[model samples]
Target: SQFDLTPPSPAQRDALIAGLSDEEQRVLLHHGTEAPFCGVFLDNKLDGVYTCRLCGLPLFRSNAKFDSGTGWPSFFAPYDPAHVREIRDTSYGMIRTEIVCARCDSHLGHVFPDGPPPTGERHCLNSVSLAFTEDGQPLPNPLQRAGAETQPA
Candidate 1:
């Protein structure tokens, strides 16, 4: 099955949140920003889809990445447009649009207007907010369980 926008149940979400590290909780739950230039994906040049750390939703495609030199990894576009939603954030006396997983409502980062032609926008994200899966691999699904059987023949 393809990706589903359905969110996990309360127990499942709690379990997923419990699985995250302290830093992941700060950024994904508390909207904390990880120090710049230190994100793991800052220099990663691989082929994969960037997924939500909390919900495992595909957020950005690897091909859309570009050197942003802004400390955080930047993506010019979202892989699955519907799963990404924007909200107005004015927490720091600055007007910005905050990006988050549409299903789980986890904080990702802000999207800026200065970017390459394709989107003319940069989705600057905290590396701690994402998990990378190798190209052609199945995305991690938070809603899936261990007892799932193979598709009926």
Candidate 2:
């Protein structure tokens, strides 16, 4: 349902971000490590939603987001399965799943099955990898927002 955009090429990406500070550049280009027990969006009470920062693909409905005590944004499900893509990660000497933006292939974080009741799935995500927009508000793209709303779970 999501992930319909062609991503910027690596050269274009580098060109678009050629003159940023290291900190700003890091936030813009790199996926961060979870700070053990601190994330601004963990208990975020925003009434609308969150999307991938790089691609603006709607990923989690505000209704599906909750605090999982995992120091990150936790969701029971993504807005669409294609909003996020999983790949085999070979870091830390183990084959772990890495979550990424389906549209842009930008790293978001990871998903785990340990979570609260109901759906027992935890999508632990990076705060910086997202942008939030409220319901009825102007979402980033006219094209994708329409598809997101029509797409079934």
Range of the 10 consecutive residues with the lowest summed lDDT in candidate 1: 144-153
lDDT values for all models: 0.67, 0.56
Give the clash count for each candidate: 0, 1
The C-alpha local distance difference test score for the whole of candidate 1 amounts to 0.67
State the lDDT at 115 in candidate 1: 51
lDDT string, candidate 2, 1-153, tens digits: 434556656764565456444543455465535331223465555566677665466776665444434423544235666667776655632324567777667667765556556645455566666677766665665234345444432
Q: How good is model 1 by TM-score?
A: 0.72
Model 2 lDDT at residue 92: 33
Stretches > 4 Å off in candidate 1: 32-40, 43-45, 64-76, 89-94, 116-120, 145-153
Off by over 4 Å in 2: 9-24, 31-45, 64-76, 92-95, 113-121, 142-153
TM-score of 2: 0.61
- Measured with C-alpha atoms, the lDDT of residue 41 in candidate 2 is 64
Mind giving the per-residue lDDT tens digits that candidate 1 earns over 49-100?
7788998877876654455434335442456678788876557433456778
